[PDB]
Symmetry: C5
Subunit: 273 residues, 5 copies
């Protein structure tokens, strides 16, 4: 059937269909995703007063990230369960286009508003030395937007046009490397003039940032990471992609936010942990 510029989940769903395990696991992991975001929202609000006033905007931005992450990852989960329906004759879940096609775009538009806030919020905890606040912020915001927008365009072609898919992905990757570059500077300058305890947390934040953010391009490419007609161009690749996206989102948003909160505590002139 004609699916056009649709995600590979739909092609698997329309041809092989999904086993009970593939369909249920994807539903469960996407549901856990939005559930963790609302739990995180509660954590960030309830811990605001654990740090000095000057650091509380970081807790607030974490909470702001959680609210939209809950809503968009809730929509993403419903998109999954609505798009694939059980066939009694074969006992597998097949594309049910009456529920609309499945698209990972809900997650991407969450990134569009989260990336700017996540990159911004560290600047409310650490102090820059040589770099200008305005300059770092503007670079984060510009490259952040371009990275997500170019990737959003690319993922529509992940089956229909592999060339467009890889070119847009490559452009996205360029902006990604720029952000890694700027964030590395921010971490280094942030370490200057703070306790060894604070410096250790910033080191952990850099590792978390590096691993969690790198998962995303991996999830982007997932279906083709085992080449043409590979193991991952299957329900196994669908499960893998949705697991990785969910791990990345929890790591880049919630764990990132917790570590920043712990940093703010060590830098706080009143409180301690």
């Amino acid at each position: 059937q004609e699916l056009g510029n649709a995600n590979f989940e739909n092609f698997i769903g329309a041809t092989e269909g999904f086993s009970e395990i593939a369909y249920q696991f994807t539903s469960h992991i996407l549901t856990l995703g939005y559930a963790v975001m609302l739990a995180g929202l509660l954590y960030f609000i309830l811990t605001i007063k654990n740090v000095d006033k000057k650091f509380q905007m970081s807790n607030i931005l974490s909470a702001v990230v959680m609210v939209s992450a809950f809503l968009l990852l809730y929509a993403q989960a419903q998109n999954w369960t609505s798009s694939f329906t059980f066939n009694e004759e074969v006992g597998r879940y097949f594309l049910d286009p009456s529920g609309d096609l499945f698209n990972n775009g809900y997650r991407y538009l969450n990134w569009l508003i989260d990336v700017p806030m996540l990159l911004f919020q560290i600047l409310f905890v650490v102090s820059l030395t040589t770099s200008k606040f305005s300059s770092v912020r503007n670079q984060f915001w510009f490259s952040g937007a371009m990275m997500i927008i170019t990737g959003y365009i690319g993922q529509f072609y992940e089956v229909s046009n592999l060339t467009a898919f890889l070119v847009w992905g490559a452009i996205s990757s360029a902006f990604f490397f720029h952000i890694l570059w700027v964030m590395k500077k921010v971490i280094n300058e942030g370490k200057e003039g703070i306790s060894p305890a604070g410096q250790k947390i910033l080191s952990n934040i850099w590792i978390l940032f590096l691993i969690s953010w790198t998962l995303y391009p991996g999830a982007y490419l997932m279906p083709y990471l085992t080449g043409v007609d590979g193991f991952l161009y299957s329900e196994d690749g669908v499960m893998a992609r949705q697991l990785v996206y969910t791990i990345a989102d929890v790591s880049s948003k919630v764990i990132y936010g917790v570590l920043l909160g712990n940093l703010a505590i060590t830098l706080s002139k009143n409180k301690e942990l």
Copy 2:
């Protein structure tokens, strides 16, 4: 088929239908729209005590704007996904009237209650000099209501009666120019007697206000901005309209509210 006084989204949906990209993008952008409003709601509540008591009503009004914006833009998003259904034979999304026709009216009624609050809330941060509070408020509220009501009537005719569409739009535009006039005065008087930092933020507020508010009439006209049978009388114009409305709403409500909060901080005798 007979659609009557219906938005052009329905005519595109009933003839050409929407590609995966056009349908999914519109769904995504409308969903982002209501998600940003609920995120904004949290931001405005959590930052209330960042400014002196006298400024806190501005945070409160921002929050009030967010609550209804979330609800109305949520309804608007559901209206989209319910009104267009995938056709397996051609692989495009076509008008599914069992979900009702699509209408941008949910967004308009949000404007009706938001415009008065957005125009009002700046008067809790800045001090007027030459203008009377009651006079400015009454002009904002009267012209604000008339602008939205006349526009709301017009958009029903955007396909069925181009003349009614453009006349109501023109009347709406008149009230719009009046509001721009009054708000310009409010900004100028607000700058008088405050720190240069506060004056700079008010300058940014004026630019944001001018650009964000002008996007609306653009979105109103979107389908016809490339003339008869133009590039925008298509799924591309639908995508463009819903993107512009979403950008305008985020800018005029959330970013506006953040800048007013930042102004209140600079004017606050405790914070800096």
Copy 3:
């Protein structure tokens, strides 16, 4: 088609159907209705500490009114969109009984719990002089309940039995006049011993109360206000009724609550 004791919206929907404008406008105005109630909820909670402790129960009761008004007016909005479905052949929205018949009863049961709270809450801002708190409260609550219950019964017959409709409406009106009487006394006693600023706000509250509460019996009668087969026995009367109910509910609940809050501020020593 047998509709029995059903609101006239269903009869219009089953015969003429609704134009795009009539259906969409009604959907939009009913949606705005519940949206304003949730916005009001936030306003009343966030402004609690703007008045002295003794006045804060009024903010609390406003908030209590908003919560149930949001839920009931949300249900009322869904009742509308579920009950009328687009017919592609004629391009109008017709009664779709699979969604149940439309009934204004959700709004009425909101009134049942709101009327007592709205009448009660002014007694936490103003001080009575010659009248006893308990006596005024008991009169408000008894007449308030009877007014809503008798009206609720009446509106089921607004098409099926014009006599029952008008008799129950008349009984309801009697209790309404009693409430107007008691509220007038409350306003007068409330004005005694407070600043001219406070007295002005109470005057505005009385005008708001009088206009907003009178809109309701108007919305009750709406379909027949232009007589048999008049202009209002149509989709135009449906639009008019739902607009008036929404204006009345916003005015009697939210604007009323804001004015009471502003009164509390002027009467506040802080």
Copy 4:
């Protein structure tokens, strides 16, 4: 039609069906029910700081009761509208089993967690004299659980097996009388050593408790209170049962909680 161990609402719905008034009223009253619970939730949270710290646990338990009452009574309302669908040919609402059968069990499981908290919370406001806190609590919790569980079992048989229905109901009634006994002692001991104002509120709490709690067994028996093929074995009995359950739940949870809060205020040193 084979309905098995199903509530009588289904048998009425499957045979006579429900008139517009019977269906709409039941929908409205069940909706009001959950709407009042969420409004109550707001009231109990916003008034926590109106009493001394030692009494605030009572406000908290009221709020805890409201949250689950909202959710369960919301589910109960949706169960009603989903189970009965309009038939255009006769103009009545008939059992639509695609929506599942209607069962009052959502309300019962709410009782299971509410009864223990409602009986418990008064022990945070009044001081016992003869009785031990732990002992009264344990009696309330044990008899409360058995009362609801035995009743929950019984109501499944209210049509399929009148004997099982009446026996389980009788066992439930025994636990009910035990609770009335213990609560009476608690009220009496609570009156000892407090202001006459506090004693009057406790008297009102006892009357509210006695009337509101006795409504439940009445609603249990409702369909048969006019005997075989009586007036109440009808849509009129369905309306009556759902009205009584809603009045009882509002009274036993919200009004009870308000009176306890008012008692806590009179006993408060601040």
Copy 5:
């Protein structure tokens, strides 16, 4: 019918179907489950300031557990009502695969994020003596994750492959015994140098932990606890499993959280 690697609920539903009591009870108990979690959420937020700052993280983690437990157990309840539909001809609820198959996986993924937080939060109330905080935490988190993941895999095979089901379950059990071991040490070290009041609560916490956590493997095996074609390989086993899971979740999360809060109060210098 071809169901593949599906839970036994689906096989009962596809063959015998469910009686009114079995279907309604399961719906009610699953609904109570998520309702208790949201009520618990309110309790934990409202009691945060009842303990010294250093203990408040325990209240916060209880609340965090409640939020996701509400959402996941809500999804689990909807999965039940969507998967089984009334058949009018036989009067039983049969598998309706248009609603997707029923899977207990929503509950398992709640465990995945809850187990780490529940094991973690006690370390914010008690003080270790001989054991290192980081070491206990890392063991809890590693074994906690492996226990849930291995169990999650196993339950997909509970009908399709009894060997895989029992082997994965056995591996899960190994990690379970490790956690019981570490938690026992934590309780013992926690008792050292604290008031008798604190020691009593920790004893109660250990009993609650031991009983509530052991319910889970019981619910895992439920269908086969009476052997092949036993009493429990039926709607009675489905009811039993969902009851036990709901009791376990309430006990391990809410009651556990309340006891930890009570411990924090006794250890609080205010």
